């Protein structure tokens with residue numbers, strides 16, 4: 548019953564996890580200081596030359612042409628790449644191993660990898676390959692050439708007919724995430740990407756957490772992005788948070804406000820002002836007088852931007868769907884991803900990156916004196 552798990556791609560002990568373990572053993576011991584131990588050198592003698600050969604046969608960063616950097620995050624960047632052997636175009640996310648360990652979070656990527664690898668959903672960016680080298684994790688994803696929703700809003704004045712459509716796709720994308728047993732926690736326009744047809748997919752699942760059997764999570768850390776974080780996730784900081792998927796619906800209200808107003812509803816000059824605007828949302832949420840927002844739109848926004856106990860969506864997404872804001876002549880909840888998107892991108896090339904702004908232009912581990920094992924947390928990341 549064990550040879551199933553060697554073949555199983557979700558298994559901790561498949562062939563590509565086993566190779567990871569061999570490879571990281573060689574990397575965490577091959578130093579002059581540690582080769583004064585003869586056990587260690589007895590191993591490096593036997594294996595160092597075949598481990599270097601298989602390193603050449605495994606997928607590596609040098610198999611790709613880097614065309615452009617199109618995204619950045621706390622621990623790395625996203626590159627537009629072309630696989631040279633196959634000429635296929637991809638988006639490749641890099642995570643710095645030094646910076647994930649020097650900042651003591653080295654476990655978020657497991658859920659990101661598994662969602663994109665296995666969600667098999669039209670609402671989730673698909674992952675094709677995960678591999679690593681001694682400095683970086685790599686995630687090879689389908690390239691989303693329509694750009695993200697930040698870029699769309701900066702380029703257009705968004706009519707309600709459009710916000711209607713993008714809100715609905717976000718709602719459906721989040722509903723699919725929830726049905727996998729996950730709360731997103733970092734829903735925002737930077738995480739919402741558009742494919743060649745102008746339809747949405749979610750991309751940055753670094754904050755995702757699996758729910759209880761009650762549909763709740765225990766968490767004592769505020770997570771996500773300051774403009775979009777919900778009161779209950781903010782309040783959970785140091786305070787035994789116990790909350791459900793409806794935190795994601797709060798971020799949908801912030802998104803819809805930003806689309807129709809032009810600004811986030813809790814903008815402040817400082818992070819702590821934003822945090823205190825959010826805590827005081829019953830009085831700080833205020834629509835600009837010159838904002839010609841319909842009354843269905845204002846109602847849906849205020850129905851999302853309240854406390855969780857009365858938040859639209861607390862009881863399920865059917866009550867979101869029937870909201871009159873969503874009445875329209877272009878799409879149904881049943882077929883929206885098969886209808887014409889509001890902005891279909893005009894693409895000049897299979898590496899057209901015109902919907903992404905340019906981004907401009909590292910530290911490494913200290914040579915160890917004893918066995919530290921900096922590569923052990925990344926064992927099992929490789930995936931084909």
Ligand SMILES: CNC(=O)c1cccc(Cn2ccc3cc(-c4ccnn4C)ccc3c2=O)c1
Nearest residue numbers: 618619620621622623624638690691750751753
């Ligand atoms: C803890 N998190 C981090 O350190 C980190 C590191 C790097 C990036 C990010 C956030 N981010 C930003 C842009 C982005 C774009 C694509 C994409 C797919 C197809 N096209 N594009 C442009 C896919 C994923 C991301 C993405 O995750 C976060």
